[PDB]
């Protein structure tokens, strides 16, 4: 925008942190002016603290109000634990099976250096193991991966490629372990 | 296990733009459409299991607006330093000929949260089927955004996501072909 | 089942 005017930005974060489900919960409230956090409430501290001089008047005014501080501490139960239980079925317990395909990167004769591709996409959650098998045996040497890609979508995608010399009678299996499966998925190329 | 639920709001002057959204482990659960006072579920499924009183978001934004004015006055009208975005362009899934996919333009690591995004197919700006997420939070207080274009994959068509942002000295033009 | 927001507080003036 050819518009030259100065901008002023206010951001607020309430962060609920869950360990072993709701066994341990931590609440972080964060006031952020022009990308710099000024004041925060941390449930592990239980009061407001200036992160910069600009925040000092707000820490002091808020911490002044006993009943206010008492509710902010109770919010680990009345906000964090509550909202966790609201979303659990479709959030924490969300399982979406990956689509797994394997194909060569080049059609070429037997006995030649090839790249075999194992694309795994559409999956949730992010936790997953893809392992490469030659005739029954796994290998770790020539395994390259694009890592975990977030689609913005509540789905992830990944490639794991395998550098390999295909030989007469060789069967290659891509092995995917994901929380959605009662036991790993397997797709072959012969 | 380990989960994080974030309630993230912002207000920006002089644009008078405000957003309200909840985040679970880096995906959006919902945001509030301020104009229509409606909760917008990132997947429609979620609205079948849970509700949110959208009006609540407008009380928080009113107070965000009041706080932005106080902090502006306190800072003696010090403005934000523009941070330019990084742009990745990628596909929703692997790409097969004549099997409809979706093109993602991912825009990351930028503030303030105002960008202009254009989809160019063979040089023509295209608008058919386009959608976008809201401005998503990052731990460093910068923003992420997703822009989406459904399309038919072919060797005929070449793609560009064009991003404009105050932190850039010219528009970023990120390319995709098959 | 209903999500609850936490209220933003007004800064000192």
């Amino acid at each position, epitope marked *: 925008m050819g518009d030259t005017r100065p901008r002023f930005l206010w951001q607020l974060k309430f962060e609920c942190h869950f360990f072993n489900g709701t066994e341990r919960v931590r609440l972080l409230e964060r006031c952020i002016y022009n990308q710099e956090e000024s004041v925060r409430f941390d449930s592990d501290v239980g009061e407001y603290r200036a992160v910069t001089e600009l925040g000092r008047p707000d820490a002091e005014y808020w911490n002044s109000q006993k009943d206010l501080l008492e509710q902010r501490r109770a919010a680990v139960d009345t906000y964090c634990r509550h909202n966790y239980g609201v979303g659990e079925s479709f959030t924490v317990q969300r399982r979406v099976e990956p689509k797994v395909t394997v194909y060569p990167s080049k059609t070429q004769p037997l006995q030649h250096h090839n790249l075999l591709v194992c694309s795994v996409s559409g999956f949730y959650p992010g936790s997953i193991e893809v392992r490469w098998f030659r005739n029954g045996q796994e290998e770790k040497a020539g395994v390259v991966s694009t890592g975990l890609i977030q689609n913005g979508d509540w789905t992830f995608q990944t490639l794991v490629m395998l550098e390999t010399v295909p030989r007469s009678g060789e069967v290659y299996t891509c092995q995917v372990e994901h929380p959605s499966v009662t036991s790993p998925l397997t797709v072959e190329w012969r | 296990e380990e989960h994080v639920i974030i309630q993230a709001e912002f207000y920006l002057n002089p644009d008078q733009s405000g957003e309200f959204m909840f985040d679970f482990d880096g995906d959006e659960i919902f945001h509030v459409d301020m104009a229509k006072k409606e909760t917008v579920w990132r997947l429609e499924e979620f609205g079948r299991f849970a509700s949110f009183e959208a009006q609540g978001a407008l009380a928080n934004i009113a107070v965000d*607006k009041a706080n932005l004015e106080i902090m502006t006055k306190r800072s003696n009208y010090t403005p934000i330093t523009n941070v330019p975005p990084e742009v990745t362009v990628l596909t929703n899934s692997p790409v097969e000929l004549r099997e409809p996919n979706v093109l993602i333009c991912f825009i990351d690591k930028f503030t303030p949260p105002v960008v202009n995004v254009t989809w160019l197919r063979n040089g023509k700006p295209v608008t058919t089927g386009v959608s976008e997420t809201v401005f998503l939070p990052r731990e460093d207080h910068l923003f992420r955004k997703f822009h989406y274009l459904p399309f038919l994959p072919s060797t005929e068509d070449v793609y560009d996501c064009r991003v404009e942002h105050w932190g850039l000295d010219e528009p970023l033009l990120k390319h995709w072909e098959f | 089942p209903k999500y*609850v927001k936490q209220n933003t507080l007004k800064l000192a003036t």
Partner: T-cell receptor
Amino acid sequence: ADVTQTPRNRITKTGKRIMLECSQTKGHDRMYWYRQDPGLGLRLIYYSFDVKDINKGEISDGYSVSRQAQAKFSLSLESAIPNQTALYFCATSDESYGYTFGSGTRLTVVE
Amino acid sequence: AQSVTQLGSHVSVSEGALVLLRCNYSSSVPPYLFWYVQYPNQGLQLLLKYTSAATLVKGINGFEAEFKKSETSFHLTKPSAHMSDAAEYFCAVSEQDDKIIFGKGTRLHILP
């Protein structure tokens, strides 16, 4: 007083548009109009969380409001009927469920 | 459906005796709860407020109320009824939605 209502006492004939005014000095974003009747408690008519923000309560029918400024929240009886005879209370709320009620408007609608 | 139920429009207590006013609530959400008093020919005054901080809430003049989740109750008590306790009392709930829904109210009559 933070919250002041005008008028404090009004008689009106049925079929008339009449306006009750609430004004506040604590610069609170949340404002509310309630009516109180014997045996029914306070019922919420309309509420506002920002300038030009309007939300229907339990009993909005026969009423309208405006929030042109932060300091003021106006209630209008569109076409006054006798069962709109009540004590009307404007309220503001802070950010932590601290309500301040106005001292009330006694409105009597006669046929 | 956020609601609060008070029992009895008009109730009596002997001067000097324990005051007990009943309120039961209905909420999908851990609530804010309130008791207000309206003294004759005046407005509404907050007596006390439940915020989940503590199950025993204390207010002005010896008023107290105990939150009991298991019987969804928030009964107001005062140790000794005075003539000046004659008033209307209202219980109120918010399902954390920044609006207070009121019960129908109980007027307390003090028998001298």
